[PDB]
Amino acid sequence: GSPVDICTAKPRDIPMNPMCIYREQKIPEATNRRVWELSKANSRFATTFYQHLADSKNDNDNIFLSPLSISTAFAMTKLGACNDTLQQLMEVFKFDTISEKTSDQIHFFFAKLNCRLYRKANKASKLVSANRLFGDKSLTFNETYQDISELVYGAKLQPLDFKENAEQSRAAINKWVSNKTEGRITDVIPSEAINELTVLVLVNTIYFKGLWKSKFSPENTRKELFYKADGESCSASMMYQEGKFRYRRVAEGTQVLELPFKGDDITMVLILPKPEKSLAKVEKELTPEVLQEWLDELEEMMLCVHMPRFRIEDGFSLKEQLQDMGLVDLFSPEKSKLPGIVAEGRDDLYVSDAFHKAFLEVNEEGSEAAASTAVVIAGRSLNPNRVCFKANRPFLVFIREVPLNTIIFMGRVANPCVK
Ligand SMILES: *[C@@H]1O[C@H](CO)[C@@H](O[C@@H]2O[C@H](CO)[C@@H](O[C@@H]3O[C@H](CO)[C@@H](O)[C@H](O)[C@@H]3O)[C@H](O)[C@H]2NC(C)=O)[C@H](O)[C@H]1NC(C)=O
Ligand SMILES: *[C@@H]1O[C@H](CO)[C@@H](O[C@@H]2O[C@H](CO)[C@@H](O)[C@H](O)[C@H]2NC(C)=O)[C@H](O)[C@H]1NC(C)=O
Ligand SMILES: *[C@@H]1O[C@H](CO)[C@@H](O[C@@H]2O[C@H](CO)[C@@H](O)[C@H](O)[C@H]2NC(C)=O)[C@H](O)[C@H]1NC(C)=O
């Protein structure tokens, strides 16, 4: 190619100029100060956004998003944003809660994170991204932007004929995502979500395929009762397994359990509150630092584990939620301001809509693995010598990249029962 591999390259190289500027804390040994802060930022938007979304939903619904996906997709947007259609971004995404050093070169450090993130040991531990911008052809996009994107995020903007071929462009965008996601994330943008009036469109999804470092034996899976919040219970395929796992019983009996994937770089963390206590309180108590304290406190332990098969997922229309959180100008044709993408080809450029889509399907094998069918037996005698961690009541769920300490996925399994 022409430029230098961004991953190895430092800031003292690759001239990155954003048309608009916005200008100890015990960090673990062997850590990139800059990346670490940036992450500290994403995890804030994470819990924040999760809680806000959780209020809108009902304690009996499953939840699932990818804070990293969105933080990433919108960072792109802000590559060429300005004024309020920038301050808001920075504020909403917590980028203004880190050093001016990091808060400045956010695209650089996001590039670095993406580097340690999407490279690979491509074992049974894969992680594919699919974030992209779609704007109408009837506009000339700043090529500076275009280049920087491709290098930092690697996608550049994409012009589609919205004004004359919406349903065709819809299929275009759709057939792009149902690609990067190995024909798995299908129908990102729904019909009538894009019309001849669509200006700028934002899509963003993350896909994770992986196998448990310590799989469950299908012969141990069983039909047991999962008690929902509304007091009513239901049958679920409870998976069983006994081994040493990082565990931690925190405040008020809430248990934290970590199950790593082949590689130990990606893991699923469960936050399970005791039978009586409500997940709602825990969710409200959730702060980036609390989660961190819990993670560090973890200690390998020999335990008995009951976890059920399940699939949580959700196609998001962030526009609503985000602005409701304070992200306004960007979605407003009048107030927006993205001089970084278009000077003013056909006037006011703004994000018509933003589409999210993430899903998790766990079983004996791993995430997005080989499902089984062997008729699930019933009943389960009590394990002698020891009780047991049982996710037979609403629990939290986080899919994290450990080295980079980044929350890739977060959700709630409030009801995993027979679909
Ligand atoms: C296409 O968009 C890019 C940004 O997305 C534009 O980048 C230009 O980069 C230069 C780098 O030097 C900026 O210079 C300014 O320097 C002063 C120094 O006092 C600083 O205070 C400013 O914050 C800024 O870094 C420049 O502002 C920025 N765009 C401009 C000229 O405003 C690029 O110029 C765009 N190209 C086109 C054809 O519009
Ligand atoms: C960002 O905001 C600043 C201040 O709110 C803008 O600066 C003013 O822009 C108006 C044009 O609407 C000029 O008439 C003023 O002279 C500018 N400064 C003053 C004296 O208020 C700035 O233009 C905005 N950036 C853009 C163009 O997006
Ligand atoms: C996603 O769809 C397929 C993945 O199943 C990709 O396959 C390529 O398809 C294009 C035509 O769209 C061919 O020119 C390539 O030769 C195919 N193989 C390659 C090089 O990957 C396709 O590129 C992806 N993109 C889209 C828009 O569907």
- Domain residue ranges of the chain, discontinuous segments joined by +: 11-211+308-364, 212-307+367-416
CATH number for the domain running over 11-211+308-364: 3.30.497.10
Tell whether ligand 2 has an atom less than 6 A from the beta carbon of residue 87: no
Binding-site residues, ligand 1, Cβ < 6 A: 17-19, 21, 80, 142, 144-145, 340
Angle 164-170-173 from CA coordinates, rounded to 5°: 120
What is the rounded distance in angstroms from the CA atom of residue 412 to the CA atom of residue 397? 6
Q: Which of 19, 143, 341 to mutate to test the pocket of ligand 1 (most atoms within 8 A of CB)?
A: 19
Closest CA to 11 of 102, 99, 108: 108
Q: Kindly list the distances between the CA atom of residue 10 and the CA atoms of 13, 15, 72, 233, 323, in Å, as whole numbers in the listed order.
A: 6, 10, 20, 55, 34
Measured by CA distance, the residue closest to atom 29 of ligand 1 is 19
Q: What is the 3-state secondary structure (H, E, C) of the chain?
A: CCCCCCCCCCCCCCCCCCCCCCCCCCCCCCCCHHHHHHHHHHHHHHHHHHHHHHHHCCCCCCEEECHHHHHHHHHHHHHHCECHHHHHHHHHCCHHHCCHHHHHCHHHHHHHHHHHHHCCCCCCEEEEEEEEEEEECCCCCCHHHHHHHHHHCCCCEEEECCCCCHHHHHHHHHHHHHHHCCCCCCCCCCCCCCCCCCCEEEEEEEEEEEEECCCCCCCCCEEEEEECCCCCEEEEEEEEEEEEEEEEECHHHCEEEEEEECCCCEEEEEEECCCCCCHHHHHHHCCHHHHHHHHHHCEEEEEEEEEECEEEEEEECCHHHHHHCCCCHHHCCCCCCCCCCCCCCCCCCCEEEEEEEEEEEECCCEECCCCCCCCCCECCCCCCCCCCEECCCCEEEEEEECCCCEEEEEEEECCCCCC
Report which ligand 2 atom has the smallest distance to the Cα of 83. Answer: 1
Give the distance (Å) from ligand 1 centre to CA of residue 159. 23
Q: Which of 169, 174, 179 to mutate to test the pocket of ligand 3 (most atoms within 8 A of CB)?
A: 179
Closest CA to 106 of 72, 132, 83, 138: 72
Give the distance (Å) from ligand 2 centre to CA of residue 83. 9
What is the rounded distance in angstroms from the CA atom of residue 189 to the CA atom of residue 356? 9
- Quick one: tokens of 248? 């931690």
Tell whether ligand 2 has an atom less than 6 A from the beta carbon of residue 349: no
Give the distance (Å) from ligand 3 centre to CA of residue 176. 9
What is the rounded distance in angstroms from the CA atom of residue 316 to the CA atom of residue 49? 13
Q: CATH number for 212-307+367-416: choose from 2.30.39.10, 2.60.120.10, 3.40.1440.10, 3.30.365.10.
A: 2.30.39.10
Was 116 annotated as part of a binding site? Answer: yes
Please, how many CA atoms are within 13 Å of residue 123, restricted to the half-sphere of its CB?
13
Q: Give the experimental resolution in Å.
A: 2.8
**Do 42 and 67 touch, CB atoms closer than 8 A?**
yes
Residue type, 187: D
Q: Dihedral sign, CA of 244, 246, 250, 253?
A: negative
Give the distance (Å) from ligand 3 centre to CA of residue 231. 49
Give the distance (Å) from ligand 1 centre to CA of residue 18. 6
Give the distance (Å) from ligand 1 centre to CA of residue 46. 31
- Quick one: tokens of 320? 């609503």
Strand pairing category for 299-308 and 310-316 = unpaired
Residue type, 236: A
Report which ligand 1 atom has the smallest distance to the Cα of 79. Answer: 5
Distance of CA 24 to the CA centre of its chain: 28
Report which ligand 2 atom has the smallest distance to the Cα of 82. Answer: 28
**Do 103 and 25 touch, CB atoms closer than 8 A?**
no
Query: In 10 A of CB 14, how many CB atoms?
Result: 15
- Quick one: tokens of 177? 């995502």
What is the rounded distance in angstroms from the CA atom of residue 264 to the CA atom of residue 208? 14
Q: Which of 16, 17, 157, 337 to mutate to test the pocket of ligand 1 (most atoms within 8 A of CB)?
A: 17
